[PDB]
Structure formats: structure tokens, C-alpha cells
Design a protein around this ligand. Structure first.
Ligand SMILES: [Zn+2]
Ligand SMILES: [Zn+2]
Lengths: 127, 25, 91, 97, 151, 97, 214
RNA sequence: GGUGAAAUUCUUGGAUUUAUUGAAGACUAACUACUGCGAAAGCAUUUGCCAAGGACGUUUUCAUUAAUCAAGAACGAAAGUUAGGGGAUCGAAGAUGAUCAGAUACCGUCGUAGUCUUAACCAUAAACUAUGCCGACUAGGGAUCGGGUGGUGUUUAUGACCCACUCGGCACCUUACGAGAAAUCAAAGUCUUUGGGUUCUGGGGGGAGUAUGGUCGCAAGGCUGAAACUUAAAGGAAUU
RNA sequence: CAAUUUUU
């Protein structure tokens, strides 16, 4: 009965965003970002920001007629921490609470064959 | 003092002692 | 036997024109008319006729190779660029 | 390995180098097993096998050309083609392909 | 015809308009690359040996493979004559006298007790013929390469 | 002096290994040295799986688990892995805890 | 300004036929107005669907499929086959330490005018009454079987066009066949094909449209 | 955007994002280890060609053909050079944003040389196992790779394994009789109970791998290498 | 984030 969307969560550092789209995966819908739920910019990856964003993402998809979403978390990917952000469980849990069914979910973090030398340099990120 | 920068001094105050052999002589 | 020691090939200039220059022409003009081996004769008697020509003395079959050598650095990558390509446009 | 095989021919295999001799060996229809080179002129190439349709002899095309058949038979020059008119102790003439 | 060849074929002697008999990339050595096909309105995305992209139709001509004469410019001439014998069948463009040691009349730069141009060298396209010498309507001077496909 | 018996990093008679990349400060280190300790938990919250199984279609579907591994440097090793020091006699041990 | 969500076609998708029931989702595109109508709009997209709905299988929660879409017709659009790759969890739930890995491709010009790269993966276990940990084969058996990997999948393929090779992948009977050939050399753990990616769609192909429904 | 926190820079000309293709060149994840291979540096994605090397097997063969080496030689990470190709990512110099008193430093966003390839170069690195090369013997103990020999052995003759043994590896653990300054050591043992061969190096630290002389380089520089003067430690290990 | 000098 349920129509199936795909969320494609960008869970990373300094921000977090998400946009529901069709099961094909091109016609994008309702992409709220970290900068639209807070004006601080130092907590857009904090779970308070993804708490306000996820329920707005479903409510902007509610008048669309989105019933269920195959969400897809993904980390920072590429050549960084390879870890989901602090708001990664904050956009998932709030979307389940805001009245939207979830199914058939895993991640799409792009695993490389480790190459194209990372930034910082040889002697690491001194800090 | 790492001895790299003991060695960087003495290997370019050598040539300024050694580039007197082209202007003078 | 080995008449002079370092210049050799382009010693015919003498003492003029530089020496950073005539040790770069040394590296090229040895290639410019040394007898290469063109592959469709099984011999080595192909030499310069003009900047872009090569001509084998036997078998009388003149290629249209590179400027100074018989085949450039960019010539060996184009013949595998289409030989990358001539398969999958068919199969 | 075929490069094990044809090196054994020099023992007692009655063979002949050259082109006109290769033809003249192929003239009598007694000679078998024409061996050719890759970078031969192809207009020279065809009348080798066009006779060899009529004497039914196998012509194994060798994956190397003229200049690398020379050290592959023993002599020191650029031997183009090779006819094996007899190979009394061998393995080539049957086990090829 | 480039519409009948697939991606990435490094080509030459290609043509800017269909049916014109040769116009593009036929100098001594250089090539040209094709980077695809827009299917509808059958034009394509073509580079060029200085980096400016260009759009040309489907049925334009073109031969694959680079032009002979590779690496030619980098050996020095070493001789005034092999430049004079270079400019034998082209022009009387050789030699090129400099307009700074020139008389104050025959060139807009010369004259003085020293040899200084005084005015700027880069004069615009708003300037009109008989005075554009020096440098033709430009922005960046100084020793730094302008490279193609920057990061 | 000497402080570690198997001196640098599990390595005798191989000269050079290849370098690999730290994840906490982007450092390149020799591959045998730093640490390779895994990470496998789940993809859930503080569990909240009752919240999942009410919001799961095709019921509860996975208990969805993850995989990752970490390479550190030497500096952020004892800055994050809470060991920071070992006693003199327990340097010799090879205990997983 | 406009709220452009009331401009799409609340449209469907469809599955290929050689499966169970085929209504496999719904999409949202556009209106078919002038200036390149929404009829020939998409024509290239992919359906990132797992097999879990197309066969109802719960154990096949991995191997996400993508789907070639070509046509549209009468508030419907019919679909062709693209290939498959595993989910990113089910690889790394098997590659642990103290074993070896074998991967050996052979792309193959199939019956009709496609060509498609195919992969494999292998795993080694120790047949109990064991004492070892690392479970290696002698590095020539690796050399031996990874070439005979490259003719097991030159027998089922090159013949019998892939619209029934998908009827050979969903029971994984080729992965059953790898257990047959490597049964005496070095035995193995569970073997999968793990990848297939397509690269030679020839043409518009209205002739294969009517095959993938019924 | 990026950090602790912000500012560069980009963006209503559709950024960051989502899909579809496609290209450029680099690089070889997850398997990857107390493991392999090479004289050393180094060496990891497949298949083929060319030659080479190690270990074991033998009741095959030749009979000192041998160990080390001054002079002389082949190889030799990265950086750098010289000349072409290619030039993604990183990134000295530099630009530029925070930082503080200064930041042309750390941190940030860019970015030419180099990074990649071919030809000529340079002979240096903690090229560290800070353990020259060879031969004998001296305590154990369990692993582990490669070859080899057996067992009333499971699986499907077969191949992997289990056990017992042995060869040669790379290492580990116990222990000391032994060794030393200690830390430690199966070699750093068999050394005042001093002699198995054999190449090299050091005589306080400084000046200094400096001056002059020579030689090798296209240059950076490399090899060989003092004296004048100066002055009691510099130092190695270990307990509080 | 930033923490310097404190004197045979
Ligand atoms: Zn010829
Ligand atoms: Zn790191």
C-alpha cells in the first residue's frame, strides 16, 4: 500500500541534509539543510539541528503524498573519517517518529581503493 | 639544534667563501 | 679510435653558439640521421630525407613518420588509443 | 612449446631455408610444413599458401616476424620463411593444432 | 565523419563546417579531441589545441591520428641562416627590427637620449590601426604560466 | 638506549613495507605499526529498536549492522585509546585486553 | 513561488517479467506539454530496488538490482535488465582476517549484441579437526582455479540470452556450479558472483519490449 | 566552506547536493599477519612472453676447482637537475583568512616546481637489526613458511588437513650455566682458564666532514682530508 | 584555539 521514497542522508561534519526523491532517484523533493533550522552554523551537525530538520522533511513530503521511505545514510565518505555524523541517528529517529514508515535501509558510503593522496601532507594533521 | 641546521649553515657559507675564486682570481 | 671525448656528434661547430644548446642538439641530432630499423623489411637501412619523411634504402617504401625520430612519444599512444577503441565499437 | 619443437629439427630433420629453395622444395609436392614470418610482404605471402592448397601442407603462421626467426633457428641472418621437407625425428608435423 | 565515431578518438583535419574541404588542426603535429555527442540537434563538444572549447555539427569530416612532425620547435636553430633559410618560402617577416631603437617617426615607441617606451605597452582594441603596437589588448603580464584544466 | 625488544613494529628482514593513512589526523605511517582495531556495533540509536520495529515495513528487516576499521598515528593513539602507558614488566605481554 | 509539486505525473514503474509479480513502485515526473514533452523525458534512469520485493525472499535482502528503463506507454513504462551488485554490508560481513580472496573476471560477448563484465569472489574455511587459523592455499591453486573460474562462466553465458540467465542468477545455480569444479583442488567456503556491470546496449529495442510482461 | 570558534572561496548565471554518462592521470584498499621474495634499496589488481634465483630430492657428475679483499668495478629510496610527453590529487616558494605582541609559523582556503612516464644525470638517507663475511660446537619449548619421509587417519583414486620426523628459513617464549657497565643477549656465547680464518674502522670533545691540494660531476655536491687555536669534560647505562 | 619570560 505504501509508496516508497528514498531519503539519501548526507550525514557529515559541520552540517547534515537529506532529500526525499522517487524510487528511480532523480526527481528531488524538499532538501532542508543544516542552515535552515538554526542560525549558529556551529551546531548544524549537532542532533538538535537534525531533530528540527527531519520532521520538516517528512511534513514537506506529507502534502506531497510520501508514505514510506527507503532511507540511505551515508558518511562523510571519500577520504575522510568514514563515520556517520552526530545527527545521523537524529534524522533517522525523528523521521520514524514524525509519522513516516521506514523500510529496506543500509548505507552507501563510497569505499575507495585507497589512493589520490589525502590532504594535510606527510606529517599528518598537526593540531 | 638539530644538526641538519648546523649543516645548512656551513654548506652555504662555504660557497660564499668559494665564490671569491671567480671574482678575485 | 674514439677521437674526442665528450662532444662528438656536433663537434663541427667549434667553440661558438653556447654549450647548453649544443648538448641538447647533441642529444637530438644523433637521432636525426642514425640508421633505424623499419619493421616491414627486416633490415635497418632507413634514414632522413626531410623533416617528416623517412625512407628505407632497400624495399623502397617511405613511411611518413615523426619529425626527428621515426615515431614520436605521442605516436605510440594514439595507435593504442584506437586499438583500445576499435573493439568495443564493434564488440 | 613450439620453440622447444622447431629447435629439435636441426638434428636430422631435412629442412631448407630461403625463399626460392622453399618454393623449389614445395615444387615437387614432397615437402611439407611451410613456416612463415609475420612481417613478410603480404604479396609475397599469398603464393606460398596458394600452392599449399594444392599440396595440402600445413602452414603454421609464426607469431614472430622475419628478424626474430633468425635466432629462433640458430643461424645469424634474417631468415624469412622455412620449409621442413623432412623431420625424421620431431613432434611438429602431427601435434601442431 | 565524427558523428560516426565514438568517444575519445584523438583526431585531426576535422572541419568547422560540413562540406568546406579542411580547416582545423592540420598544423605540424597537433591533434584535436572529441568529448561526446549531444544527440538531439546533433552537435558535439570538442576541445582545441589551445583549450578553447567549440561546438561543431555531426557530419563534419575528420581523420584520426595526430599530424606528423612531432617535437620540431624544441631544437634550437643555432644559426642566423637556418632562420633565414626557414623564412625563405614564407614571408619577408625576417628580421624584425625593434621599435624602440627606431627613429621617433617610424614607430610609436622610439626616440630619446635613452631607449624607453614611456607610454604603456598594452593598448586596447578601442585603439585603432596605425598605433596598436606594444601589446594587443590584454590583462595578465608577468612570469607565470596560464595552464589549461586548472584545479 | 633500547626500550622495545621486538624493536619498532613487528618487522625483521623486510626493509620497507608500504605506507598507509591515519584516519584521525590524516597521517601516513608504516603499515605494520600503528593499530588495526575494528569497529562493529549496529546502525541504531541508544537502541530505539522498538521505535524501529513499529516504523519498519517488511517487519524489523535487519538489525542493521556496520563495519569500519581505524588507522591512527602515534600522537592521537594514546590521546584517544585509553591506555596511555604500560608498566615495565607488562610491556612484554601480548594481551588482547 | 509556484510550489511546483503540482506539476508532476504521479506515475508508476514496472518490473521485467522473469520474476514474481511486477508492480514494483511509483514515480513523479512532469507534464507532457510542448517543447520536448514528458513522454520522451526520462529514458535512461535506473531503479535501485533490492530483490526482497521482486521475489518475496527474506534471505536475499542483499543484491540490490538496477533497472534499464526504455519506453513509456499509457500511464505505464516497461523495463529491461541492467545488472546487480551486492549491498555494501554483505561484502564486509564475510571478508575477515586469516583467509584469502580470489577475484577473476572474464567479460563475454553474449548471444545477442551485448557485452558485460562479470565478477566472482571466493572464501576459504578449514574442515574441522583443524588447528590452524590462517587457511591458505598454496598460491598456485589460486593461480589454478582463478583461470578455471574464467571458463565456468563461459559455458552458461555465450548462448541463451540473459533474459533467462536472470532465471539462473536468482537461484544462484552458477554459484552452485563453482562448488562442483573446485571440489577437489582446495574446497572453499560459500562462493558468490558479487558483480555484473553492463556496457553494450545496442539500440532502442522495441523488439524486446513485449517479452518483459505478459 | 572550514575549524575550538569564525573569516576566505563559491552560490537564484541554478551552488552544496540527486541521477545519467564520459574523460584525465595518479594509485593498488577490505585479504595484509610475529608471514612470503630479493645481495641491498625495494617489492602488492589480473593474463601472456622472456630469461633468472632459492629450497629439497638423488646411490648422477668434476675433483680443491675454495673464504675474505687494497686498486678497479655493476646496483643503489626520496629530493634535485637537463630535455620532451602527460599534468588528476597533494603541495616547498608565494598568495590569502583566523592566531597572538610579532605569524611572510602551527590552523584555514588556493596554487607554479616536484609528484607520473622516456632518455641522461647525480651515489647520498636512522641505506638501523645503530649487530662486517665464513666455519665448528653449546640449554630447552611451542609455533610458522617452503621442500621431503611415514602413519590401519577424516573428507571427496584424488587435494587440503591431523599426528610423528627432518632440512633450510623469518621470528617468538622460558631459563640461565655463560657474557658483560647496565639495559640486555642463544648470540653481543665458547676472551687474562687471553690465538678457528678474514676485510675495514676509532684514540677526548671541539675546528669539521672546514682550509689548501687532487679527482668525479652540467650544477647542486660527493670521495680523500689536516693544521692553528681551545679545554676538562663531553658522554653511555642505571637507582632515588 | 591561544599559556611566553622568569636569569652563575
Ligand atoms: Zn625497409
Ligand atoms: Zn588520521
Amino acid at each position: 500500500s505504501q509508496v516508497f521514497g528514498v531519503a539519501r542522508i548526507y550525514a557529515s561534519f559541520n552540517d547534515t541534509f537529506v532529500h526525499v526523491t522517487d524510487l528511480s532517484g532523480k526527481e528531488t523533493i524538499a532538501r532542508v539543510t543544516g542552515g535552515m533550522k538554526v542560525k549558529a552554523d556551529r551546531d548544524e551537525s549537532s542532533p538538535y539541528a537534525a531533530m528540527l530538520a527531519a520532521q520538516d522533511v517528512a511534513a514537506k513530503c506529507k502534502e506531497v503524498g510520501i508514505t514510506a521511505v527507503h532511507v540511505k545514510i551515508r558518511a562523510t565518505g571519500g577520504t575522510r573519517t568514514k563515520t556517520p555524523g552526530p545527527g545521523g541517528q537524529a534524522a533517522l529517529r525523528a523521521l520514524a517518529r514524525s509519522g513516516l514508515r521506514i523500510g529496506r535501509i543500509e548505507d552507501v558510503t563510497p569505499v575507495p581503493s585507497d589512493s589520490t593522496r589525502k590532504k594535510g601532507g606527510r606529517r599528518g594533521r598537526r593540531l | 639544534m638539530r644538526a641538519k641546521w648546523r649543516k645548512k649553515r656551513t654548506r652555504r657559507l662555504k660557497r660564499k667563501r668559494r665564490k671569491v675564486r671567480a671574482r678575485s682570481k | 679510435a674514439k677521437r674526442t671525448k665528450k662532444v662528438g656528434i656536433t663537434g663541427k661547430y667549434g667553440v661558438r653558439y653556447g654549450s647548453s644548446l649544443r648538448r641538447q642538439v647533441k642529444k637530438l641530432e644523433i637521432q636525426q640521421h642514425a640508421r633505424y630499423d623499419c619493421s616491414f623489411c627486416g633490415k635497418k637501412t632507413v634514414k632522413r630525407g626531410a623533416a617528416g619523411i623517412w625512407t628505407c634504402s632497400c624495399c623502397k617504401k617511405t613511411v611518413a613518420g615523426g619529425a626527428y625520430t621515426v615515431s614520436t612519444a605521442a605516436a605510440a599512444t594514439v595507435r593504442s588509443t584506437i586499438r583500445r577503441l576499435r573493439e568495443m565499437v564493434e564488440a | 612449446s613450439i620453440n622447444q619443437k622447431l629447435a629439435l629439427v636441426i638434428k636430422s630433420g631435412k629442412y631448407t631455408l630461403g625463399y626460392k629453395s622453399t618454393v623449389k622444395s614445395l615444387r615437387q609436392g614432397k615437402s611439407k610444413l611451410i613456416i612463415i614470418a609475420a612481417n613478410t610482404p603480404v604479396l609475397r605471402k599469398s603464393e606460398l599458401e596458394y600452392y599449399a592448397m594444392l599440396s595440402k601442407t600445413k602452414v603454421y603462421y609464426f607469431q614472430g616476424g622475419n628478424n626474430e626467426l633468425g635466432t629462433a633457428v640458430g643461424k645469424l641472418f634474417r631468415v624469412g620463411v622455412v620449409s621442413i621437407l623432412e623431420a625424421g625425428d620431431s613432434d611438429i608435423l602431427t601435434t601442431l593444432a | 565523419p565524427l558523428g560516426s565515431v565514438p568517444e575519445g578518438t584523438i583526431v585531426s583535419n576535422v572541419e568547422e563546417k560540413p562540406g568546406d574541404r579542411g580547416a582545423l588542426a592540420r598544423a605540424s603535429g597537433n591533434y584535436v579531441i572529441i568529448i561526446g555527442h549531444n544527440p538531439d540537434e546533433n552537435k558535439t563538444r570538442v576541445r582545441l589545441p589551445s583549450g578553447a572549447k567549440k561546438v561543431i555539427s555531426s557530419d563534419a569530416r575528420g581523420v584520426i591520428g595526430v599530424i606528423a612532425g612531432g617535437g620540431r620547435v624544441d631544437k634550437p636553430l643555432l644559426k642566423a641562416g637556418r632562420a633565414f633559410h626557414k623564412y625563405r618560402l614564407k614571408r619577408n617577416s625576417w628580421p624584425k627590427t625593434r621599435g624602440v631603437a627606431m627613429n621617433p617617426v617610424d614607430h610609436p615607441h622610439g626616440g630619446g637620449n635613452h631607449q624607453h617606451i614611456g607610454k604603456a605597452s598594452t593598448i586596447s582594441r578601442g585603439a585603432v590601426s596605425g598605433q596598436k603596437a606594444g601589446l594587443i589588448a590584454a590583462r595578465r603580464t608577468g612570469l607565470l604560466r596560464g595552464s589549461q584544466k586548472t584545479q | 638506549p633500547k626500550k622495545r625488544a621486538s624493536n619498532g613494529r613487528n618487522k625483521k628482514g623486510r626493509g620497507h613495507v608500504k605506507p598507509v593513512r591515519c584516519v584521525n589526523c590524516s597521517k601516513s605511517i608504516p603499515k605494520d605499526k600503528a593499530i588495526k582495531r575494528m569497529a562493529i556495533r549496529n546502525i541504531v540509536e541508544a537502541a530505539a529498536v522498538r521505535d524501529l520495529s513499529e516504523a519498519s515495513v517488511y517487519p524489523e528487516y535487519a538489525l542493521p549492522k556496520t563495519y569500519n576499521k581505524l588507522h591512527y598515528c602515534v600522537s592521537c593513539a594514546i590521546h584517544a585509546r585509553i591506555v596511555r602507558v604500560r608498566s615495565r614488566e607488562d610491556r612484554k605481554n601480548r594481551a588482547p585486553p | 513561488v509556484v510550489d511546483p509539486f503540482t506539476r508532476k505525473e504521479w506515475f508508476d514503474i514496472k518490473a521485467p517479467s522473469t520474476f514474481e509479480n511486477r508492480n514494483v513502485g511509483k514515480t513523479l515526473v512532469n507534464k507532457s506539454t510542448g517543447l520536448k514533452s514528458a513522454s520522451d523525458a526520462l529514458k535512461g534512469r535506473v531503479v535501485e530496488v533490492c530483490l526482497a520485493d521482486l521475489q518475496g525472499s527474506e534471505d536475499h535482502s542483499f543484491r540490490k538490482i538496477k533497472l534499464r528503463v526504455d519506453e513509456v506507454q499509457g500511464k505505464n513504462l516497461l523495463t529491461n535488465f541492467h545488472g546487480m551488485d551486492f549491498t555494501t554490508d554483505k561484502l564486509r560481513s564475510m571478508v575477515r582476517k586469516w583467509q584469502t580472496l580470489i577475484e577473476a573476471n572474464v567479460t563475454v560477448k553474449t548471444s545477442d549484441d551485448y557485452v558485460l563484465r562479470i565478477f566472482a569472489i571466493a572464501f576459504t574455511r578449514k574442515q574441522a579437526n583443524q588447528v590452524k587459523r590462517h587457511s591458505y592455499a598454496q598460491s598456485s591453486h589460486i593461480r589454478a582455479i582463478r583461470k578455471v573460474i574464467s571458463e565456468i562462466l563461459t559455458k552458461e553465458v555465450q548462448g541463451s540470452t540473459l533474459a533467462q540467465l536472470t532465471s539462473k542468477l536468482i537461484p544462484e545455480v552458477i554459484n552452485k556450479e563453482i562448488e562442483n569444479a573446485t571440489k577437489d583442488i582446495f574446497p572453499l567456503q560459500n562462493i558468490h558472483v558479487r558483480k555484473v556491470k553492463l556496457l553494450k546496449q545496442p539500440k532502442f529495442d522495441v523488439g524486446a519490449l513485449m517479452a518483459l510482461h505478459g
